[PDB]
């Protein structure tokens, strides 16, 4: 009867086209502002002093870029970790010079993605679902907050944060290799196993369902039209695909349970990306990966090279060349 109850009834209605919910009250204003500023800053945005040395790095399309090289540049080294909104900038020209829109996009992104995650919970509550799709979405939220939030914190500047682009991503990955040795760190190892394993069990499960489909169509029409939507009959012989994989490797390595099978597809990647995103986090605070340089010596004591020493000389090439003007002192403490 009241105005608030007629508003709570609408905002929590599943009869809307897109469910809004109470998290959409701060998902939609956040992500539309992260979007509408991203499209403008990617297309039309002046160059940005990223190294704090007043050498402005172009990143937008109107200043001679493309899809690959164009990128929303991170904020300045001069700012660093300080909060830099528009009203604390004394003009928009001073805001866009010092890496303004990187903080406006990222902070409205991480609020909107952490609200998109809670929105996946909310609709599962109002639909009668068991709730935990949003726990599986915690794994890219852990990884998005690792390279945009946690790594600028432990390194003390948003300038070490990830550039919102495509070539800026590979500037981020290579400089992160030289300074932290991520490939030898066992948490990037535990998530390469998460996505190689994840793409394995995806294409391994998706093939054994498509292999054991039941005849419901003719050879002229499509294979997919043998599934009517909302039917109650099972659309594939699960005993058939169990007997196949029960002979392809051996018998006891096969899940006859389809529920425990469809749980292992959700376990393996998500655990692999939780562990990986806490690799960037523990390497944000300079707890680097393994270092086996000069580890094998002869009885005389001369250093015998290994593959890690060849990997070290690739890291030394990126270390002596990243931010080639920003350094003045012999050790990259930042």
């Amino acid at each position: 009867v009241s105005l608030w109850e007629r508003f709570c009834a609408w905002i929590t209605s599943t009869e809307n086209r897109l469910y809004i919910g109470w998290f959409g009250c701060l998902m939609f204003p956040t992500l539309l502002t992260a979007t509408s500023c991203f499209i403008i800053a990617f297309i039309a945005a002046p160059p940005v002093d990223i190294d704090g040395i007043r050498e402005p790095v172009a990143g937008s399309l109107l200043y001679g870029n493309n899809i690959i090289s164009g990128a929303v540049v991170p904020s300045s080294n001069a700012i660093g970790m300080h909060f830099y909104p528009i009203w604390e900038a004394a003009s928009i020209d001073e805001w866009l010079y010092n890496g303004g829109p990187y903080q406006l996009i990222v902070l409205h992104f991480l609020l909107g993605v952490s609200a998109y995650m809670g929105r996946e919970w909310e609709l599962s509550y109002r639909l009668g679902m068991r709730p935990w799709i949003f726990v599986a979405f915690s794994a890219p939220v852990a990884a998005a907050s690792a390279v945009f939030l946690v790594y600028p914190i432990g390194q003390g500047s948003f300038s070490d944060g990830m550039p919102l682009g495509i070539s800026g991503t590979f500037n981020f990955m290579l400089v992160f290799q030289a300074e932290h040795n991520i490939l030898m760190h066992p948490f990037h190892m535990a998530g390469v196993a998460g996505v190689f394993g994840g793409s394995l069990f995806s294409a391994m499960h998706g093939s054994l369902v498509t292999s054991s489909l039941i005849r419901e169509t003719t050879e002229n029409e499509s294979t997919n039209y043998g599934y009517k939507f909302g039917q109650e009959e099972e659309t594939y012989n699960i005993v058939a695909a169990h007997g196949y994989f029960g002979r392809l490797i051996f018998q006891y390595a096969s899940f006859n349970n389809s529920r425990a099978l469809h749980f292992f597809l959700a376990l393996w990647p998500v655990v692999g990306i939780w562990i990986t995103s806490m690799g960037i986090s523990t390497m944000a605070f300079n707890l680097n990966g393994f270092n086996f340089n000069q580890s094998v010596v002869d009885s005389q004591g001369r250093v015998i090279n290994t593959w890690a020493d060849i990997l070290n000389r690739a890291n030394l090439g990126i270390e002596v060349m990243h931010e080639r003007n920003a350094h003045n002192f012999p050790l990259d403490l930042a």
């Binding site: 086209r17 499209i39 297309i43 399309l61 109107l62 870029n65 493309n66 899809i67 939507f229 909302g230």
Partner: peptide
């Protein structure tokens, strides 16, 4: 002149995302 093509590819991609969400073929039981 060159960046005009890149912008048209990007907003043209966001058009077909708009039509796929709202003008989707709504699936129906029976």
């Amino acid at each position: 002149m060159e960046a005009l093509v890149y912008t048209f590819l990007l907003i043209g991609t966001l058009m077909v995302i708009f039509f796929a969400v709202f003008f989707r073929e709504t699936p129906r039981i029976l």
